[PDB]
Symmetry: D2
Subunit: 194 residues, 4 copies
């Protein structure tokens, strides 16, 4: 008995390394992992500078990936305390999955990142989590499971793994915390499944 | 000295009527009112079953409408406790206005709608309010100003004007609350501007 | 094996009947249930209109009751979008349990009530949930499991079971939704403990 | 015309110094400032290690203080994403002010404190703000008014002034941000009161 973890994310920066690090932790805990991204929604003018080169290997998410999953790791870089327009759009397309209660009972964990110290590390996850209540999905926080969560001065908190700053490079603390989120969501996904 | 009020919304159903009632209530309070909508962002395979005819007279919003406004009435029907992808994507494009503090200090009020009694009437507004914090915009709730806010059994509350049901038409008490929200945003925007 | 379910609540009104109905539903799902209340924190001159004559058979909560439980049903009447001062003060005493990670991993479901239609049926649960993030407790919503959650126009919703009005008597919809929340928390608690 | 600013807070540590700085910034903006704290609600057992002597100069808040004020700076150290039980209990006693619409239309700003880097610096403010919706009070965020709000690596942010760590002493960045919040609430307070 092995859970299917879907690591879903919007973004092209440090959120990509966060998604891969979560999936790494989920694999080491013993789970089938699929890392998927959402379609871009910003008008054409914004899309010219978007670095698709570092995400060309990561496939676009289908609704079949949602059905395939026993557990979810949904993420987005903060956009003023909320998830990005890209991810929100895709979550709006899951209306058929809602009418049929496909995702009901399945666990979900949330991850984000912000440029400044307190610019959407906690609130973004709390606002994202409203989605879980409507779908009947159990929210899985990481809390203070590993010592690194007490010790971190950069990214990551009880609400979920994060990244501090604009650059795409995760430090040691942020990597340990992200992998732990992979573990925690696997453990709960295994409990509900098996 | 009269303030400009922008009523900005996503949607096609009952949300349009709420927008117009917020607009009307703001004109009665003596404000220059523009009702604008956002660019649709859903994949074309999910618009079916999306009527663009109800929004023919309502033109798309521009970024100059944002600096024009002295107050805001940002709205969206609920999409599982959050604003819709359409509104969220537009608010992402306001990153141009962010760094140079264009919207700083300007009032904002929020409104939504939900088909079920407790399925996004409150939380959608609280999750929408985060935007105001990052931009330095002051949040204007309705509270319990008019007696209709205690009396309402269908749509409307202290957080903002709502509509109950999956239908288009909105009832008497729902209409009055929306006007009061338009009044409230006008009163606060005038206070900040004319000071 | 059967899970231990603690139904913890502040209140004296209809939140008591909601607490009992959740406990009733939890034990039908096959759980060991203890219903407890929290100590009052209000200054004495505000305890005037409080009827202690109705919550005399429900014992105060201890910190080892928290240790006893495999799952939780935490509830409070809305106090302006947040929980009541009594429940909040109790949760502040659980600092030692946080430090030692006693409640880590345990499921938790939230419930509330409000006298007015959109006066804290959704937001109160959302603000209560932050507690669970800091403790690493998995949050259990009810969503739209039973068809009663679509059909209800009074109390109860996806965020948790609620009551509309000031009176104590719950209606048929509200009682079924509260019973379902007890069933849900039990199902999740059984999965984490035994499975 | 001069606005009255009430700085209301729970706590005994670095939250107190945050309250004084917001008071100072409001005074420099040109307002009468009353700094008040709330009654303790924690049971005797959990009052073993509390320095009351740090707050003995600051009087307890009364319901008259809420009527007096034209603007509010309400704060509390984070208690698992929410305000402390002491502040929550006092706010529950303001039920008469709610029924009389005393605070309706008045501006309110929020501030908090957390030991860990993302352990309630911004959610505490978002949770506290629900109070303002029910009372019809208008919320005043600080956003990114001063350049220090971009720069800070310790405490402070768009949601409100904060302190990072279990230390009591605030660093330079934090005092600048706290004083700014006091300036920010005063500006809105006199705009609502005086202008019309």
């Amino acid at each position: 008995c092995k859970p299917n973890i879907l690591v879903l994310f919007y973004g092209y920066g440090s959120i990509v390394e966060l998604a891969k690090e979560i999936g790494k932790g989920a694999e080491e805990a013993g789970a089938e992992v699929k890392i998927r991204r959402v379609r871009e929604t910003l008008p054409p003018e914004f899309q010219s500078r978007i670095p698709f080169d570092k995400v060309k290997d990561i496939p676009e998410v289908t609704l079949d990936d949602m059905r395939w999953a026993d557990g979810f790791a949904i993420g987005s870089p903060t956009r003023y305390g909320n998830m990005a327009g890209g991810l929100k759009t895709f979550l709006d397309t899951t209306a058929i999955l809602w009418k049929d209660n496909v995702l009901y009972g399945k666990p979900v964990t949330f991850f984000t990142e912000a440029s400044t110290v307190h610019g959407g590390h906690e609130t973004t996850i709390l606002t994202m989590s409203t989605y879980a209540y409507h779908f009947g999905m159990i929210i899985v926080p990481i809390g203070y499971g590993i010592p690194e969560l007490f010790q971190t001065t950069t990214g990551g908190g009880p609400y979920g793994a994060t990244h501090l700053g604009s650059k795409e490079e995760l430090d040691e603390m942020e990597r340990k915390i992200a992998r732990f989120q992979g573990k925690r969501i696997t453990e709960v996904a295994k409990a509900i499944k098996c």
